Design a protein around this ligand. Structure first.
Ligand SMILES: CCCCCCCCCCCCCCCCCC(=O)OC[C@H](COP(=O)([O-])OCC(O)COP(=O)([O-])OC[C@@H](COC(=O)CCCCCCCCCCCCCCCCC)OC(=O)CCCCCCCCCCCCCCCCC)OC(=O)CCCCCCCCCCCCCCCCC
Ligand SMILES: CCCCCCCCCCCCCCCCCC(=O)OC[C@H](COP(=O)([O-])OCC[N+](C)(C)C)OC(=O)CCCCCCCCCCCCCCCCC
Ligand SMILES: CCCCCCCCCCCCCCCCCC(=O)OC[C@H](COP(=O)([O-])OCC[N+](C)(C)C)OC(=O)CCCCCCCCCCCCCCCCC
Ligand SMILES: CCCCCCCCCCCCCCCCCC(=O)OC[C@H](COP(=O)([O-])OCC[N+](C)(C)C)OC(=O)CCCCCCCCCCCCCCCCC
Ligand SMILES: CCCCCCCCCCCCCCCCCC(=O)OC[C@H](COP(=O)(O)OCCN)OC(=O)CCCCCCCCCCCCCCCCC
Ligand SMILES: CCCCCCCCCCCCCCCCCC(=O)OC[C@H](COP(=O)(O)OCCN)OC(=O)CCCCCCCCCCCCCCCCC
Ligand SMILES: CCCCCCCCCCCCCCCCCC(=O)OC[C@H](COP(=O)(O)OCCN)OC(=O)CCCCCCCCCCCCCCCCC
Ligand SMILES: CCCCCCCCCCCCCCCCCC(=O)OC[C@H](COP(=O)(O)OCCN)OC(=O)CCCCCCCCCCCCCCCCC
Ligand SMILES: CCCCCCCCCCCCCCCCCC(=O)OC[C@H](COP(=O)(O)OCCN)OC(=O)CCCCCCCCCCCCCCCCC
Lengths: 105, 318, 96, 51, 345, 115, 83, 171, 98
């Protein structure tokens, strides 16, 4: 913040819910809690520029967890290949993907 | 089977609404030293069917100045919201089991107010405009007060579901701990349902007919059905919330019978009140609900915040 | 009366939650075993489907880390039926 | 620096309170009755109302 | 206004920027902006004239639209990164929308069209409160995200702010409009030095505030809203002409006044960052600003405009209006150039 | 799914009722039939004219009070917190501030209607 | 004071709603500060087990935590049972 | 990146408990009292090693303990437990308070036989220590090496050389 | 979720476009502001529900509170404008150019 009155007085008016891995009601972990924790643990103490340069792996893992762009691309490629194989008829779904299976608890 | 459940909820509610019209005529007559309808049918029991058939075989009005789209939209909206408000009530098992039941009730009630407002604006008439503005003021006052009342009651209850209210009143009515806000809730339901002395939108003597003064026949029937279904609805909600019927796990028919008797008593109390009292002035209704009910409601809301804390009677989450 | 009945209700709720706690390890074991089985059959189906696709690694993760990432509903029900997908998505919300 | 597009401007008032034309009060005119329950049948009460 | 509502409104006016500056969370910074806007509207419309009503309406819709764009940027950043602060990898589109909305809240060109109009039609003390206090919180928000902003868009906004401020101040005769275009030009300078060194942004902001406050106080002495009204000041308050001239020259950036120091050090930092073309264009438009200041000085101090007959009665009457804090601010905004290494950090 | 089904059934029922109400009876409409109602005389002016509102301040206060209601509504889950002292103090402060605002408006005659 | 009591009686006679509202406000303020059950509400909410009690790894150095749930050691709820 | 390693269906094969939720809730407290150690070991391994594939043996042990528990109940206390879980299954929430006579009879049966005691209020919900020979994972998050901080400069705070050095100012 | 979020962003863009492109009705401008507010609320709520950020779930309610205060002040200013002119016309609100 522009003024550090909260840090000078030691209080936390808004500093304890600044991100997903912060304090949560009834210990309900948010999505990508581990990824955001790793990103903050990497980026702490080295500054913004070094955090952008050197914690790129942690930031990319956190971003992939949060937005799931590559997961969507991979699933779309799998489903597109599956429907192409269905169109040319050289593939059939297994029973457990087609609705009839042996359920387990 | 679910469609059969929909039918056996919807159709008996409609027949109970029509016989509520008949029983209002009979009770008002016998309180006015007369008899009421006993010719049309054995004891007048065919009078609502006669009225319904006459209204649905009379031609509707489509005035030249009137916005046709909203004029059509408002009465069907009113009837749909009345039946939707009826749908989640537990007797002791609801057709649709919700978590935020009273929030659904509040949203649907405000949308019914919008049906009244759009009818009044679409029927391009000055008396309809008067009815719409009176509806605006009325729903302002009762909306704020009734919301705080229901908040305090459910703070005593612990959750927004209504089976939870049954479990809360398993041993004792909420009328005994919460009888002042029960009175204020009863007045709020009168104002919500637009019953005398707080009708003020179908103003018979002040206006001509108010918001539905340009409505005729079928749409007027839809408005009347919506209003009287809302009467039975709000009295059923009052007896579910405050006068808890006896609930036993082995037999729910006792709960249904006790609920029916208390809801009939509250509806008859509505008709009794309409017979007894003259109509408010609509600024006096706002002054009442904002100067007498609202400060006491805020005080009792603070009291019901404090009460489980210092009694350690914080209700369960489930 | 409301104080006494609310205290009794709190004790009953604590008893129900303790029953849930006692049953939770078995449910957790069954749930992760079922999730692992679903992921395994999805992996086998991916191996069957995209064996002819060039430059494709079967079962390649999208994360640089090697720790466990719990799969999404879209991940574990993407290749199954649309009714099962809708049951996994809107089942609890639309059950009234 | 007056031009053709700004030669019609006037200096602002010293007290920033402009003299505006007095708008006519458009009160609603209502025919209370004769077909009215409160008008006793044969009264045409022309009512000039503000609200 | 009764003292209860005076205390409530003034405390919320104070509390808005304080919450914005002290807040770690973008949402709390936004609600500080909401506090400032909502609290300052009734004091704008307090005189209850049509011009004050129009000024309050224009200010409300402008700040509401800009705050909605700010909230869009905050929500989009929360969607992208899961946090409530533009940390390092937030989208450039989000940052540019934040900059654009904060520049519309600040009132710099080409988002400047409301500021002379809002400054007109409100009383002088409210113009002072606006043009000094209302710019601190958006500048604090901009300062917190200085390494993330886009230098091209910032420099374009700054150069058009200084150009339009110079031309508007050249045209206007109303004192409130003149002060508003002065605000636009100085905000242009502050924005220009923002991405390179926010310490110089704070220095220029403090110099502008301590120069703007006593000029507005001297206007508040006689409610002189016009060039002519401030021109007959020699009959009313002859002892203020020298300080008026010195403060206007300091606003013009003439050495050896202390108002030359912000423009000088901002130009120096831009030369250190190799933006010579921008620095030279900004300096020439600052010369134009100094021109309309000098015309104001010619009207009020160096010449003597004709006076009225009732000014004799005004000289018969006595006044206690100039407060203790006027002269301190005038001296600190006039004769503080030799303390320049202490004024900079 | 069940709630959506019963909402759609209500919609279909009311649409069927209004449709049979409009297509069942015999139509005979003319100009005087469909002219607006003004107790037997022609309307002097249109009903779309501005119609003054004497409780506008109460309506704005209703907006603010409705948002106070929205703030107060998570109380049945807030009472389950571990730190009940903080929740109780904050709820007391909120209701007291709301009551003080209502009392100030009542003192300043904001609840009274204009004219 | 006599005038204070007369004003209070006049308020109770003419505007009893405000008197009841202020009295209920005052009672709701002062009642949790004098009741002996106030700590019990926070203790009940703490004792309500919404989350699973995650076991700790025993290194042989903490003797206070119980090895089994049916052990004398730990936060028993006999106060709630007899409440 | 690297491919994900997850076990096969043969490794995930186990004798599942084909037992309804009402039956489980009827036997809940005694299952939490008797099979507590294996369940707590499985929860400890799951909350220490976040990967579910590192705890399949503990999960199979949990299933085996539950199967042994239910086989013992079927061997000794079949009918009271059957009517108890039936009366529990009638309720929509499976509330314990609706069926207390059946609960009392089942508790009496599992008290006179098998010596089982129902846990009191607050016993199953408290944190318990547990002894295991499974090693503590030192890097459960699979974290990389943390980057080193900046080399903080130490030394005495000498005055500024030749003043502020701001253009022509001597000090 | 991404298609829904794109549609919500386009809804905000349309409401902002309506706010920036005035017609004669200041009330319609305020309604466009409220539409922008509604789009912001829905975006924040679906983001919090998607990321399971119960700690950030008070933020949409705070947005609604401050936005309703904004709408309240806008209605009060519209009352003052209508008392001045008889209509809420932004073409009537124009006499501060000189
Ligand atoms: C339900 C019944 C619908 C039909 C009602 C009817 O009889 O219409 C007469 C119509 C024939 O017109 P008419 O009776 O000769 O003209 C007089 C009408 O009053 C003239 O109609 P009006 O004066 O009521 O004005 C109609 C107007 C206004 O009516 C509506 O907007 C109604 C629909 C609301 C939804 O509708 C439009 O302008 C088109 C709206 C298209 C849908 C909205 C799309 C953009 C907004 C999206 C969000 C909407 C919420 O058919
Ligand atoms: C659902 C359950 C049953 C509900 C009741 C149903 C049966 C009764 C129905 C009666 C017919 C109602 C028809 C509509 C009537 C409309 C008029 C009306 O009601 O006006 C409201 C009237 C208004 O009175 P008023 O308007 O005449 O008063 C004048 C007020 N001024 C001057 C400001 C205008 O009364 C109220 O507002 C009171 C509401 C209920 C208050 C209950 C308080 C109970 C006691 C609290 C605790 C006290 C002790 C505190 C602790 C002390 C410790 C030492
Ligand atoms: C669920 C609640 C609502 C229930 C609604 C009622 C349901 C039961 C209805 C039974 C009667 C159905 C027909 C009603 C016809 C009413 C209008 C009528 O009589 O029109 C006469 C007119 C007569 O038409 P016409 O050919 O003599 O000439 C009309 C034009 N003039 C008189 C000007 C020359 O229409 C009909 O006869 C239509 C009969 C339709 C029958 C449908 C069955
Ligand atoms: C049953 C009532 C509804 C109805 O008949 O609607 C049809 C509508 C009703 O429109 P209508 O308003 O002319 O109805 C005739 C009059 N009453 C209401 C008395 C029956 O249309 C027609 O009857 C004629 C339209 C053309 C039909 C062409 C052949 C269709 C086979
Ligand atoms: C004439 C035009 C009329 C237009 C307006 C129609 C009004 C309808 C009646 C009023 C509705 C008010 C708003 C209700 C919103 C949903 C309320 C709610 O809480 O729903 C939640 C509920 C289940 O959620 P929960 O209680 O948490 O349970 C989870 C575990 N059981 O349930 C769900 O999650 C189900 C989600 C869907 C519920 C709403 C279905 C609406 C269907 C569309 C109606 C309009 C159709 C379009 C117009 C047709 C032509 C006119
Ligand atoms: C609706 C449809 C029509 C009505 C259907 C229900 C009819 C019920 C009829 C029987 C009611 C019997 C009530 C008691 C009669 C015996 C008796 O002793 O009555 C007199 C008694 C009052 O006598 P007193 O000594 O003066 O009492 C002073 C102390 N309260 O009186 C009492 O104590 C009266 C106690 C009951 C008061 C309410 C009675 C009516 C209830 C339904 C009202 C519906 C209104 C619509
Ligand atoms: C870090 C940032 C620090 C603050 C910088 C921005 C200045 C903020 C000024 C807040 C107060 C504004 C205010 O109250 O203005 C109205 C007031 C009118 O003054 P007047 O009418 O003469 O009152 C005499 C009655 N005793 O006007 C005044 O009293 C003039 C106040 C001028 C304050 C200048 C401060 C300069 C920086 C130190
Ligand atoms: C802490 C603060 C919050 C507490 C919770 C309660 C919230 C109440 C909110 C509203 C309070 C408003 C009080 C002041 C006010 O506006 O009073 C107005 C009223 C007269 O106005 P009106 O009702 O319009 O009368 C018609 C004209 N004669 O004037 C009156 O009625 C005069 C009332 C005099 C008595 C006040 C209450 C005394 C309580 C003593 C309790 C002792 C135990
Ligand atoms: C895109 C940005 C430019 C849009 C220009 C639209 C036309 C325009 O300038 O409208 C001006 C109009 C002014 O308001 P009004 O008083 O109604 O004007 C009377 C005419 N003198 O303005 C209005 O009435 C406000 C209109 C707001 C419309 C918002 C939604 C626009 C949706 C379409 C966007 C453009 C799509 C273009 C597609 C091109 C082909 C691919």
């Amino acid at each position: 913040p522009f003024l550090d009155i909260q840090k000078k007085l030691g209080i936390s008016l808004d500093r304890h819910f600044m991100f997903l891995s912060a304090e949560q009601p009834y210990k309900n972990a948010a999505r990508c809690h581990a990824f955001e924790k790793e990103w903050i643990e990497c980026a702490h103490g080295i500054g913004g520029t070094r955090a952008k340069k050197e914690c790129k792996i942690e930031f990319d893992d956190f971003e992939e967890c949060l937005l799931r762009y590559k997961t969507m691309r991979r699933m779309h490629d799998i489903k597109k290949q599956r429907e192409k194989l269905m169109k040319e008829g050289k593939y059939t779904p297994p029973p457990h993907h087609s609705g009839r299976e042996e359920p387990r608890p | 089977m679910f469609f059969i459940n929909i039918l056996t909820l919807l159709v008996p509610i409609l027949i109970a609404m029509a016989f509520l019209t008949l029983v209002e005529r009979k009770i008002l007559g016998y309180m006015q030293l007369r008899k009421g309808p006993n010719i049309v049918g054995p004891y007048g029991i065919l009078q609502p069917f006669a009225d319904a058939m006459k209204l649905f075989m009379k031609e509707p009005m489509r005035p030249l100045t009137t916005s046709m789209s909203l004029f059509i939209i408002a009465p069907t909206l009113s009837l749909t919201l009345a039946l939707s408000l009826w749908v989640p009530l537990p007797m002791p098992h609801p057709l649709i089991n919700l978590n935020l039941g009273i929030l659904f009730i509040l949203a649907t009630s405000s949308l019914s107010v919008y049906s009244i407002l759009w009818s009044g604006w679409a029927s391009n008439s000055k008396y309809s405009l008067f009815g719409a503005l009176r509806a605006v003021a009325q729903t302002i006052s009762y909306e704020v007060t009734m919301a705080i009342i229901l908040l305090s009651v459910l703070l005593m209850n612990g959750s927004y579901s209504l089976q939870t209210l049954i479990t809360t009143q398993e041993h004792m009515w909420l009328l005994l701990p919460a009888w002042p806000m029960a009175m204020m809730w009863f007045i709020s339901t009168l104002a919500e349902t637009n019953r005398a002395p707080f009708d003020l939108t179908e103003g018979e003597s002040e206006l001509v007919s108010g918001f539905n003064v340009e409505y005729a026949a079928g749409p007027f029937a839809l408005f009347f059905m919506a209003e009287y279904t809302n009467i039975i609805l709000m009295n059923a909600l009052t007896t579910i919330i405050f006068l808890g019927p006896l609930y036993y796990i082995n037999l729910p028919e006792l709960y249904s019978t006790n609920f029916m008797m208390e809801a009939l008593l509250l509806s008859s109390t509505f008709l009794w009140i309409r017979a007894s009292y003259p109509r408010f002035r609509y600024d006096q209704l706002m002054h009442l609900l904002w100067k007498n009910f609202l400060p006491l409601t805020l005080a009792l809301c603070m009291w019901h915040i404090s009460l489980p804390i210092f009694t350690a009677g914080v209700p369960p989450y489930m | 009366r409301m104080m006494r009945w609310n205290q009794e209700r709190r004790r009953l709720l604590i008893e129900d939650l303790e029953a849930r706690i006692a049953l939770m390890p078995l449910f957790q074991a069954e749930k992760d075993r079922r999730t692992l089985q679903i992921l395994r059959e999805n992996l086998e189906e991916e191996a069957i489907i995209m064996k002819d696709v060039p430059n494709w690694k079967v079962g390649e993760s999208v994360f640089h880390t090697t720790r466990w990432v719990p799969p999404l509903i879209g991940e574990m029900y993407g290749l199954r039926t649309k009714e099962e997908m809708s049951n996994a998505n809107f089942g609890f919300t639309w059950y009234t | 620096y007056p031009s053709k597009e700004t030669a019609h401007w006037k200096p602002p008032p010293w007290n920033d309170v402009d003299i505006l034309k007095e708008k006519a009060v458009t009160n609603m005119t209502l025919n209370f009755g004769p077909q009215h329950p409160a008008a006793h049948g044969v009264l045409r009460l022309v009512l000039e109302l503000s609200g | 206004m009764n003292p209860i509502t005076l205390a409530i409104i003034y405390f919320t006016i104070f509390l808005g920027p304080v919450i914005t500056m002290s807040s770690t969370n973008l949402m709390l910074m936004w609600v500080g902006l909401e506090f400032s806007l909502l609290a300052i509207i009734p004091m704008l419309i307090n005189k209850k004239n049509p011009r004050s009503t129009e000024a309050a309406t224009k200010y409300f819709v402008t700040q509401a639209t800009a705050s909605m764009i700010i909230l869009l940027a905050i929500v989009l950043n929360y969607k992208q990164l899961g946090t409530w602060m533009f940390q390092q990898q937030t989208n450039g589109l989000i940052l540019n929308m934040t900059l654009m909305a904060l520049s519309m809240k600040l009132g710099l060109a080409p988002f400047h069209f409301w500021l002379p109009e809002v400054t007109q039609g409100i009383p002088l003390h409210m113009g002072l409160i606006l043009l000094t206090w209302q710019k601190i919180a958006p500048l604090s928000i901009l300062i917190q995200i200085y390494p993330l902003l886009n230098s091209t868009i910032i420099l374009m906004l700054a150069i058009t702010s200084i150009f339009m401020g110079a031309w508007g101040g050249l045209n206007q005769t109303q004192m409130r409009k003149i002060m508003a275009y002065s605000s636009i030009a100085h905000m242009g300078w502050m924005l220009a030095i923002l991405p390179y060194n926010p310490s110089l942004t704070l220095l220029n902001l403090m110099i502008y505030i301590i120069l703007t406050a006593p000029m507005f106080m001297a206007l508040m002495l006689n409610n002189s809203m016009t060039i002519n009204s401030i021109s007959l000041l020699w009959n009313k308050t002859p002892a203020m002409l020298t300080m008026i001239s010195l403060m206007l020259l300091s606003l013009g950036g003439l050495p050896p006044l202390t108002g030359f120091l912000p423009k000088w050090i901002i130009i120096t930092e831009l030369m250190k960052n190799n933006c010579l073309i921008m620095a030279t264009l900004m300096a020439m438009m600052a010369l134009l600003n100094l021109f309309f200041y000098t015309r104001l000085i010619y009207s009020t101090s160096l010449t003597m405009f004709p006076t009225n007959n009732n000014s004799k009665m005004m000289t018969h009457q006595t006044k206690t209006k100039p407060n203790l804090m006027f002269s301190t601010l005038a001296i600190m905004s006039t004769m503080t150039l030799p303390l320049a290494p202490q004024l900079i950090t | 799914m069940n709630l959506y089904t019963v909402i759609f059934i209500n919609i279909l029922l009311s649409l069927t009722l209004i449709l049979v109400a409009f297509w069942l009876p015999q139509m005979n409409l003319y100009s005087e039939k469909a002219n607006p109602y003004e107790c037997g005389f022609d309307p002097t002016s249109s009903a779309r004219l501005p119609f003054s509102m004497k409780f506008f301040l109460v309506a704005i206060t209703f907006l603010l009070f409705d948002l106070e209601i929205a703030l107060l509504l998570p109380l049945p889950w807030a009472i389950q917190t571990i730190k009940t002292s903080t929740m109780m103090i904050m709820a007391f402060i909120l209701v007291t501030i709301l009551s003080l605002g209502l009392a100030y408006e009542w003192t300043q005659k904001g609840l009274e209607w204009t004219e | 004071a006599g005038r204070i009591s007369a004003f209070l009686k006049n308020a109770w006679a003419k505007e009893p709603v405000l008197v009841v509202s202020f009295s209920v406000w005052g009672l709701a303020i002062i009642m949790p500060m004098i009741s002996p059950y106030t700590k019990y509400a926070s203790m009940i909410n703490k004792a309500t087990p919404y989350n699973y009690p995650v076991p700790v790894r025993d290194d042989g150095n903490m003797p206070d935590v119980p090895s089994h749930p049916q052990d004398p050691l730990g936060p028993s709820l006999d106060w709630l049972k007899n409440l | 990146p690297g491919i994900v390693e997850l076990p096969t269906l043969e490794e995930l094969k186990v004798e599942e408990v084909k037992v309804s939720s009402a039956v489980l809730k009827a036997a809940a407290h005694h299952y939490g009292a008797q099979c507590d150690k294996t369940n707590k070991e499985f929860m400890l391994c799951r909350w220490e090693e976040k990967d579910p594939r590192r705890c399949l043996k503990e999960g199979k042990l949990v299933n085996g303990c539950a199967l042994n528990f239910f086989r013992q109940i079927k061997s000794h206390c079949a009918e009271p437990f059957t009517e108890y879980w039936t009366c529990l299954d009638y309720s929509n929430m499976q509330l314990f308070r609706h069926c207390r006579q059946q609960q009392a009879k089942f508790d009496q049966c599992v008290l006179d036989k098998l010596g089982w005691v129902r846990p009191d209020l607050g016993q199953l919900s408290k944190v318990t220590k547990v002894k295991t020979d499974r090693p503590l994972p030192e890097n459960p998050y699979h974290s990389r090496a943390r980057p080193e901080p900046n080399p903080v400069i130490e030394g005495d705070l000498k005055p500024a050389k030749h003043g502020t050095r701001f253009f022509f100012w001597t000090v | 979720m991404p298609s829904t979020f794109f549609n919500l962003t386009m809804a905000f863009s349309l409401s902002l476009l309506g706010t920036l492109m005035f017609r004669s009705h200041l009330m319609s401008t305020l309604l466009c502001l409220e539409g922008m507010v509604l789009s912001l609320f829905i975006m924040t709520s679906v983001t919090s529900l998607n990321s399971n950020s119960m700690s950030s779930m008070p933020i949409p309610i705070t947005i609604l509170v401050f936005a309703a205060c904004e709408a309240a002040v806008g209605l009060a200013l519209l009352v003052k404008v209508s008392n001045t002119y008889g209509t809420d016309y932004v073409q009537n609100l124009n006499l501060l150019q000189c």
